[PDB]
Structure 1
Amino acid sequence: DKDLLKGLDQEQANEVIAVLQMHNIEANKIDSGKLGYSITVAEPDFTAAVYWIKTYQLPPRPRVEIAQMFPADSLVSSPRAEKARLYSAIEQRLEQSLQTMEGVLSARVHISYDIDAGENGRPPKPVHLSALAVYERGSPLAHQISDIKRFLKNSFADVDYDNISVVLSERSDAQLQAPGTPV
């Protein structure tokens, strides 16, 4: 067996495994404790495994949140920083609410950060929102955009239906059968 990767975390390991299995590559996960997880494959599959690891740029990076740049556990916080952490918390709380709607599997939301100007001495710009969501197979996407728009509109003091973008997609085919072992 050839070593592909070492010292991975749990979420990285399970991502890599999922991608390889989809392409008919049998992989194995090994635990070294404080040294993390290791991934191994057979020689006949080594070449393909390398090519897919490159193509998807695995292992995945940690997820980014704006509040990471303006830690709250700091001696002093400028108004810009506080005004940033507020929005970066509202975004996350809306994502977590969308996930509770019927038939939704996951979502992402984005808000226009007007904090990129103080707007001191100035009239504040209106808010704009963007959302992405993934649905179960057999969902009437066309009829489901309306609900989302309605729900988002009242989340903020001044929003127009024209300023809300919504993109929907269906789940891909399920990977249920196991890959074949090299002869």
Structure 2
Amino acid sequence: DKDLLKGLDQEQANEVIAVLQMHNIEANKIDSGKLGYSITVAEPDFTAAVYWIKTYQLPPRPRVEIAQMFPADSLVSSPRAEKARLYSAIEQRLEQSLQTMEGVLSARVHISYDIDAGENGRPPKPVHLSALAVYERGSPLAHQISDIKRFLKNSFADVDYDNISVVLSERSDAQLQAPGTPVK
């Protein structure tokens, strides 16, 4: 009934309703054509819903990787810019691959960017990398930690089993349950 967000694109609008129906208030993804989607909540829950817009900082910012800020359209693209979008595409591609393991729902991978190794006239640092992973319920999480940590060791040149930091966490409880319209 009461307007709460306007002009959202698609993947931002589907995330907000996922947050809201977690906290027991229903929303209505009203498309407004080329002016983006719109989310309207009922009047007794406009109070509670604008709280959860604040804490989760909804709508979500577009998920940024490093190579979006080195586009190389027609610029000469200095050798720092090549390793910037090189490793950034490797951050994305290892993320795409952990997501297709057994039971990993989602994943995030970061790479340590030793970039100025040639400019200082020094041998480069060892590559460090971090990983996040969301498993199912019921999986014994203390044993899939070894598969990931074995996997993306040899995805880089000089890493160890100490430069890999994987903190994997099982997913939340399933929201399968209808929130409910308020009473009159």
- TM interval, short-chain normalised: over 0.9
Q: CA deviation at 1:160?
A: 0.9
Q: CA RMSD in A?
A: 1.2
Does the Cα contact within 8 Å between 1:67 and 1:88 map onto a contact in 2?
Answer: yes
In the other structure, the counterpart of 2:132 is 132
Which string of whole-angstrom CA distances, capped at 9 and with x for unpartnered residues, describes residues 62-85 of structure 1? 011111111122321100101111
Deviations 1:122-165 (A, max 9, x none): 11111111111000111111111111111111111111111111
- Any conservation in 2 of the 1:24–1:180 contact (CA below 8 Å)? yes
Contact 1:104 1:133 (C-alpha < 8 Å) held by counterparts: yes
Aligned residues: 183
Query: Matches of 1:12 and 1:45 in 2, distance apart?
Result: 20
Q: CA deviation at 1:29?
A: 1.4
How far residue 118 of structure 1 moved from its aligned partner, in angstroms, is 3.3
CA contact (8 A) 1:80 1:118 kept: no
- CA drift of 1:17 comes to 0.8
Per the alignment, in what secondary structure is the counterpart of residue 134 of structure 1?
strand
Q: Are the aligned partners of 2:130 and 2:165 in contact in 1 as well (CA < 8 Å)?
A: yes
Cα offset for 1:92? 0.7
Q: 2:117, 2:124 within 8 Å by CA — same for their partners in 1?
A: no
Contact kept in structure 2, 1:94 and 1:109, CA below 8 Å? yes
How far 1:7 sits from its partner (Å)?
0.6
Q: Which residue number corresponds to residue 22 of structure 2?
A: 22
Contact 2:131–2:167 (CA under 8 A) maintained in structure 1: yes
Which stretches in structure 2 are left out of the alignment for 5+ residues?
none
What displacement does 1:121 show?
Answer: 2.1
Kept in 1, the 8 Å contact 2:117–2:123? The answer is no
Higher-helix-fraction structure: 1
Return the offset for 1:117: 4.3
1:74-133 per-residue CA deviation (whole Å, 9 max, x = no partner) reads 321100101111111111111111111111101000111011443452111111111110
Question: Could you tell me the TM-score, scaled by structure 1's length?
Answer: 0.96
Alignment map for 1:45-124 (pairs within 5 Å)? 45-124=45-124
SS at 2:6's partner residue? strand
Task: Decide whether aligned partners of structure 1 residues 2 and 116 sit closer, same or farther in structure 2, where only a CA change above 3 A counts.
Answer: farther
The offset of 1:22, in angstroms, is: 1.0
**Is the 2:111–2:130 Cα contact (8 Å) retained in structure 1?**
yes
Percent identity, aligned pairs only? 100
Give deviations 1:2-42, integer Å, cap 9, x for gaps: 11111111111111111111111121111111111111111
Q: Does the Cα contact within 8 Å between 2:26 and 2:181 map onto a contact in 1?
A: yes
Post-superposition, which runs of at least 4 consecutive aligned residues in structure 1 deviate over 4 A? Answer: none
